[PDB]
Amino acid sequence: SGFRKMAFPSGKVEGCMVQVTCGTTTLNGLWLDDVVYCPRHVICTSEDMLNPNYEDLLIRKSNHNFLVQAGNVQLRVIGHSMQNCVLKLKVDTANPKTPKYKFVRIQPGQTFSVLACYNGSPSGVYQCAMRPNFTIKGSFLNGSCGSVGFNIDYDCVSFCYMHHMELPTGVHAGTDLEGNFYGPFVDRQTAQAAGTDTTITVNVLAWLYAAVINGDRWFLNRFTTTLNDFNLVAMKYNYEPLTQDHVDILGPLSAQTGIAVLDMCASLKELLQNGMNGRTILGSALLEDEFTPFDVVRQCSGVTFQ
Amino acid sequence: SGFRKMAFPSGKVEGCMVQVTCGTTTLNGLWLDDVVYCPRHVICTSEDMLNPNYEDLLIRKSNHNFLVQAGNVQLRVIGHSMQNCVLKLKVDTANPKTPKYKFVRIQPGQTFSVLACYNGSPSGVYQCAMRPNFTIKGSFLNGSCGSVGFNIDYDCVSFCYMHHMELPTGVHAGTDLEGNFYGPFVDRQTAQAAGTDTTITVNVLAWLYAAVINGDRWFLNRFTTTLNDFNLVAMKYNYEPLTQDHVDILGPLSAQTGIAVLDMCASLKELLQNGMNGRTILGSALLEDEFTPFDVVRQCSGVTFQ
């Protein structure tokens, strides 16, 4: 029993983190085989961040302008190139700790673990979701750029996020590992704002199932609603609309608790209209939307990795 | 910016987890140098759990009754002994991944990371606090026994917790690594209950400072109270009393925000008497007590590890 915001074990990623210095700017890089990936703005100074021309900045650099350290060992850079918003640094030594990996682009509502790093050294691990407005609510200080987000599928690490910047509302924006931004952001110091965020409905439902599995039942009722009646209520409260695909995804949780998806929507419908009235669910007084259906199954059934 | 429930990177611990089988019972063990530590009830069957006599059960075993696997490699057990509630299995191979480590007993209110494991394989990592009633609010399924809790101090892993059991309220109890239980619990299937829990006041204050650092200021006020006036209010709400040592510990956070500890107590005093009234603090509608002052400093200043 119990329910916690659980991250993936980070061992396989810790062995890939390196420190990248170019000029007076130091940040983190990801070392897989003989390539080090890092944010391209490592080649920027202060004069450059308002309106950088990265093609110009890069041609004016040579391999020896880039200092790559894996702990104390220095890595010799033998070639560099730019792919969208990431720099790919070819080095003379392949990382012997390279795990089986792939590069995936995730969708809003999906979750991943973040290994926050400073100077190539891992500082902490935490779980978060990609918000519907393509930002993440992370915890990041100066120097954290190049920290990566990831999932683990059996033995395979899927990298899905590299950190680039903090927006003025205190939320965080970055790229996939091919260097393409999530959301309409750019890596310069211009005036950028996230769009309005919405609550991830399928995730709230998954969390209500986790609560039932763990013995919190007080919000249930006998009513049933329809997909269209629910979605009409959800839009009023800035909740994402629910689709038949979401219903099917919630199947395993419905079967395990004997509570039909559309039954649970009627409970959620009541919670949105009447509030929780000083009661808590799994130790929270707000509705939690950063657990996917698969997170709940994994934590309430006990899937491991190798 | 931002604030997350952050765990320590788990790499150094992942390399020490093994699977221990005795009979039809399999659980996790901790492999440091040539010793494997695991819960002693691995030597129990179903008939034994109501009233086990562990001295009798252990003398009736030999080294070959214990199957230890580190992934696929089998470890040969060359000797065994009991230390309080843990079994120490001497093996013929010293773990080459043994980190610099020590065994520490933590106090109520302190936090640590948990590497949850099944069959020797790491499943997830999460942060929790040792509650004033010596339980932890973990997330654990069947087979998770022998999972460990730990902190990292620079390069040194301090192991502080090994998991043994779930209580009927759904909370979790275990031992330090010398096998001594936290709290008045025993490793048998008798009727045991945790005592009443209290809120960890020094931790709530640290979290309020984190909120100020991150721009949440709405709960502040101009009032100041005394230690005795505050503690008189805290006891009414089942909060731990505040000591001068706690005040001193909150020093760095007071200096960074320019808000005196006793000023912040007056805000907390108001929040306890009037509630939060539909407002949130760092994304929570309840007062959070599982961040120590040191957790806040670490996350809002950016201490790494090597």
Ligand SMILES: *C(=N)[C@H](C[C@@H]1CCNC1=O)NC(=O)[C@@H]1[C@@H]2[C@H](CN1C(=O)[C@@H](NC(=O)C(F)(F)F)C(C)(C)C)C2(C)C
């Ligand atoms: C990478 N090392 C940092 C990470 C930041 C620092 C505070 N927390 C974080 O997540 N990234 C940057 O310094 C990037 C960098 C220039 C500007 N920048 C920012 O994060 C700034 N934000 C923006 O300009 C905005 F609002 F547009 F996103 C800052 C004002 C420092 C928060 C570049 C090249 C994008």
Ligand SMILES: *C(=N)[C@H](C[C@@H]1CCNC1=O)NC(=O)[C@@H]1[C@@H]2[C@H](CN1C(=O)[C@@H](NC(=O)C(F)(F)F)C(C)(C)C)C2(C)C
């Ligand atoms: C170790 N593999 C498990 C971990 C448990 C299973 C569910 N979640 C957990 O944390 N530990 C046990 O099976 C221990 C084991 C006998 C009884 N036991 C329990 O956890 C049981 N609880 C108690 O007997 C109680 F209430 F006294 F704590 C159970 C009913 C299965 C929850 C021994 C030797 C203590």
